[PDB]
Amino acid sequence: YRHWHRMSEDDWALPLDSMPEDVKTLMATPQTERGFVEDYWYNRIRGEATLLDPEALPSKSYIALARDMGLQIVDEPSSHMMGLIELYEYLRGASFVGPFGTIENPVLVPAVGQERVVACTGGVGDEEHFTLWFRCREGFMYRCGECDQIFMLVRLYYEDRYWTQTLVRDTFMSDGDMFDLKTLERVHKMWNKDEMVRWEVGYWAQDYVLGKGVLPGMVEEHTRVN
Amino acid sequence: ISTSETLNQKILRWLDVTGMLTRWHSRREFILDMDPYFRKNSGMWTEWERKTLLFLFYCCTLATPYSAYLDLQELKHQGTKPPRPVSLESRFMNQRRYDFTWMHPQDKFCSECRPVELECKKMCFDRYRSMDYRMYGFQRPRIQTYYSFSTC
Amino acid sequence: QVPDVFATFGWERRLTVIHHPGVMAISKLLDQRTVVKPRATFNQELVEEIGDYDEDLQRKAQVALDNGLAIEWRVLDFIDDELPRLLAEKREIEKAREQVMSKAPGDYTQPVFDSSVVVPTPANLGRNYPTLNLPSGDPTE
Amino acid sequence: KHFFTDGANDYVTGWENTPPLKFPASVMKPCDYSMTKPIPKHWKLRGSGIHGPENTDLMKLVLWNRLKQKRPQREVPNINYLKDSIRLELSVNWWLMSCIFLWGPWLHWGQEYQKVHEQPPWAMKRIDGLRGEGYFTWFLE
Amino acid sequence: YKTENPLYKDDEPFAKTCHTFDYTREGTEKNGLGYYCLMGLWASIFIWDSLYTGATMPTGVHRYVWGPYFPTAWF
Ligand SMILES: CCCCCCCC/C=C/CCCCCCCC(=O)OC[C@H](COP(=O)(O)OCCN)OC(=O)CCCCCCC/C=C/CCCCCCCC
Numbered sequence: 005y006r007h008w009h010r011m012s013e014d015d016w017a018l019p020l021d022s023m024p025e026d027v028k029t030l031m032a033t034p035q036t037e038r039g040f041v042e043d044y045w046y047n048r049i050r051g052e053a054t055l056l057d058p059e060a061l062p063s064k065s066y067i068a069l070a071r072d073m074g075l076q077i078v079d080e081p082s083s084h085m086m087g088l089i090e091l092y093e094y095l096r097g098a099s100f101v102g103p104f105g106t107i108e109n110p111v112l113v114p115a116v117g118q119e120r121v122v123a124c125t126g127g128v129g130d131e132e133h134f135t136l137w138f139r140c141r142e143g144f145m146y147r148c149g150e151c152d153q154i155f156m157l158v159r160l161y162y163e164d165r166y167w168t169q170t171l172v173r174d175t176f177m178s179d180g181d182m183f184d185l186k187t188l189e190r191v192h193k194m195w196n197k198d199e200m201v202r203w204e205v206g207y208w209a210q211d212y213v214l215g216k217g218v219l220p221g222m223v224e225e226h227t228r229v230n
Numbered sequence: 231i232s233t234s235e236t237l238n239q240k241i242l243r244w245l246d247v248t249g250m251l252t253r254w255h256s257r258r259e260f261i262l263d264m265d266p267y268f269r270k271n272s273g274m275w276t277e278w279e280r281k282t283l284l285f286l287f288y289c290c291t292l293a294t295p296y297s298a299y300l301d302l303q304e305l306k307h308q309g310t311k312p313p314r315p316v317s318l319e320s321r322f323m324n325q326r327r328y329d330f331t332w333m334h335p336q337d338k339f340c341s342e343c344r345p346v347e348l349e350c351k352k353m354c355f356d357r358y359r360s361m362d363y364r365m366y367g368f369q370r371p372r373i374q375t376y377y378s379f380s381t382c
Numbered sequence: 383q384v385p386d387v388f389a390t391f392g393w394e395r396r397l398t399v400i401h402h403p404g405v406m407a408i409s410k411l412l413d414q415r416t417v418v419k420p421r422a423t424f425n426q427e428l429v430e431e432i433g434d435y436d437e438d439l440q441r442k443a444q445v446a447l448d449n450g451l452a453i454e455w456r457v458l459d460f461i462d463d464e465l466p467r468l469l470a471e472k473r474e475i476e477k478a479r480e481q482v483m484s485k486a487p488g489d490y491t492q493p494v495f496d497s498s499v500v501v502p503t504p505a506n507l508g509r510n511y512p513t514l515n516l517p518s519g520d521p522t523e
Numbered sequence: 524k525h526f527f528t529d530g531a532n533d534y535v536t537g538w539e540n541t542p543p544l545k546f547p548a549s550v551m552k553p554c555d556y557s558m559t560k561p562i563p564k565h566w567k568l569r570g571s572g573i574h575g576p577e578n579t580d581l582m583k584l585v586l587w588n589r590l591k592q593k594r595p596q597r598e599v600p601n602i603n604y605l606k607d608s609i610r611l612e613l614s615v616n617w618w619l620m621s622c623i624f625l626w627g628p629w630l631h632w633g634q635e636y637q638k639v640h641e642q643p644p645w646a647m648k649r650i651d652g653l654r655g656e657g658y659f660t661w662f663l664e
Numbered sequence: 665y666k667t668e669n670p671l672y673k674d675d676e677p678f679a680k681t682c683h684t685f686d687y688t689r690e691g692t693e694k695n696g697l698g699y700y701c702l703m704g705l706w707a708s709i710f711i712w713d714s715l716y717t718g719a720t721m722p723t724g725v726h727r728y729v730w731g732p733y734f735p736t737a738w739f
Pocket residue numbers: 300623624626627628629630631632634
């Protein structure tokens with residue numbers, strides 16, 4: 005959005021030193037129990053394990069492929085929530101302009117709390133009036149006293165929580181078959197051999213499953229000076 | 231005198247003693263004269279941007295000696311500034327309502343002298359020294375000190 | 383049937399859009415910089431311009447152009463030794479492209495080719511190329 | 524340009540109101556739905572209708588304005604842009620050259636002439652009997 | 665294939681939208697002939713005022729063929 009500042013380096017990828025060292029437990033943790041860093045590396049390890057196995061991709065369904073990469077198959081419930089989330093974020097630093105509100109289609113006023121201050125400017129052209137500010141509280145269909153424009157408050161609330169991308173992913177995504185560490189090892193040997201590492205994440209991940217320091221050059225990789 | 235090069239090449243080689251010309255005519259040589267941390271960003275530069283930067287840098291550094299010459303002549307001029315006639319005290323000249331003490335509110339050194347009136351202060355310091363009070367300055371002949379810019 | 387997916391970008395400030403599952407898979411695959419590699423194709427006009435900045439690269443780039451090779455720059459520095467493998471690699475990639483393209487729809491069998499000459503592949507993960515940024519001339523000569 | 528302007532010289536965030544012209548309209552287009560044909564009455568409003576990311580063009584603008592921040596190479600601007608970027612720098616440098624090779628020489632000549640003839644070479648010699656160099660800018664007399 | 669050096673490509677045009685930027689009709693892009701005519705007149709006035717220092721103090725004696733009411737008697 006225009007109100008956001010510049011992408012960080014982390015916005016693209018995370019450093020491999022932030023990979024959890026207990027990979028064996030990481031790949032067995034349920035999604036609802038994974039933190040932001042743990043969830044990043046669960047998806048990256050599992051997603052790259054399937055993508056770096058070309059011979060199996062054509063026989064893998066889009067439902068299974070999306071699960072491996074950690075992408076959520078969309079549906080009307082989740083689409084509604086995500087859309088209203090992105091609309092809330094956009095309105096943080098953007099103007100609020102849209103069609104005239106009526107009983108059939110009230111002006112939708114997203115909010116996290118139970119109230120949001122709103123102003124009615126009336127219709128277009130000569131039907132526009134001076135700003136009339138009012139407090140839009142949930143559970144009431146508001147009508148402007150001047151132009152009769154109907155307003156309504158929409159709350160991004162779900163089960164004692166507000167709506168977030170993390171909440172939407174946890175509520176609607178279902179964990180599939182438990183990730184098999186044999187796949188990690190098999191793909192690791194595929195792209196990492198004879199001092200050539202073409203899957204750096206899988207070389208670090210396999211090292212942790214082995215106990216940290218087992219694979220060649222990994223003790224030297226983990227030895228820091230400050 | 232080397233005859234293995236042309237006269238033009240010899241002159242350019244000597245003007246390249248510090249490598250300025252080589253860095254202009256070689257991108258690789260310019261990037262490898264950068265410290266490694268900044269060499270990382272070099273590949274994005276255009277040749278237009280690179281040579282324009284060198285041109286601005288070279289013009290500036292080559293004019294610094296000229297400014298230095300102009301400044302030295304200025305120092306010499308001030309170091310031997312000609313005496314000027316003593317000012318007649320005209321209708322509106324040398325008006326004082328109170329002594330000059332804003333520099334030394336409590337000590338009140340040279341209350342009669344003006345802030346940068348060096349000859350008045352010298353005689354005033356001499357009075358203080360004759361009164362057993364030490365003051366600094368106005369005792370060494372100019373030609374017997376360094377950086378005076380008044381030596382023949 | 384291809385399902386729609388949510389694709390999110392950013393770490394702390396996250397922007398979510400809808401996207402194609404296959405397009406996202408390709409996007410992540412191209413992010414594997416060690417596996418999927420960009421390769422350069424030259425033309426005579428650009429090869430000549432290279433000489434203005436690196437004479438050695440011009441000669442090596444000319445060899446690549448003469449053989450119509452799409453070559454990585456790191457490999458290009460060793461084209462003198464890698465040329466026989468590069469020519470063999472070119473043939474195998476072409477064979478594979480032809481086989482997959484000509485196959486009937488719904489036939490996703492792997493192509494038959496010699497993977498030992500194609501890099502990067504499991505069969506040949508490449509060579510440990512030595513840095514060539516070492517001066518070899520005496521300034522006093 | 525030096526000064527930052529949100530609309531034109533927005534270098535702090537790099538936001539651009541419209542997509543690159545290189546992109547086909549089918550891929551990305553400027554966010555402009557002012558020409559939308561009248562909606563049929565039997566169509567029903569599903570979305571909010573509010574100007575925002577529900578519109579495809581606006582969504583793609585936000586997405587691109589964030590994913591454009593990482594690029595494999597530089598987008599070389601043309602020489603006109605490069606000249607404008609350092610217009611003041613180049614002009615000041617030429618001003619310094621003028622001050623050294625134009626102002627310098629004639630100022631020296633005037634002082635040397637003044638030494639011999641008491642007044643600069645661009646002044647009217649006085650007969651009043653007053654002494655000294657007198658004015659220098661004769662056109663402000 | 666054929667390519668174009670980016671340094672010599674032309675400037676990209678403003679996008680054509682509901683909100684379009686257009687400077688073509690302003691005529692503020694560069695100094696025009698009128699500006700250079702102002703400079704020429706300034707140089708001329710500067711030289712004239714110095715060369716002919718009695719111009720501001722003219723002579724009231726006037727003959728004027730065809731009298732004073734003829735057009736060439738006003739310049
Ligand atoms: C067939 C066609 C041939 C045409 C030939 C054209 C020849 C033109 C020659 C022009 C020579 C001009 C010389 C100017 C010398 C000025 C020297 C001077 O004043 O030095 C000191 C002065 C500063 O003095 P201060 O003591 O600080 O006092 C002033 C400030 N307080 O220093 C400067 O001004 C520095 C700049 C010096 C510039 C010298 C310019 C020389 C120009 C040569 C041009 C040659 C052109 C040849 C053309 C050939 C075409 C076939």
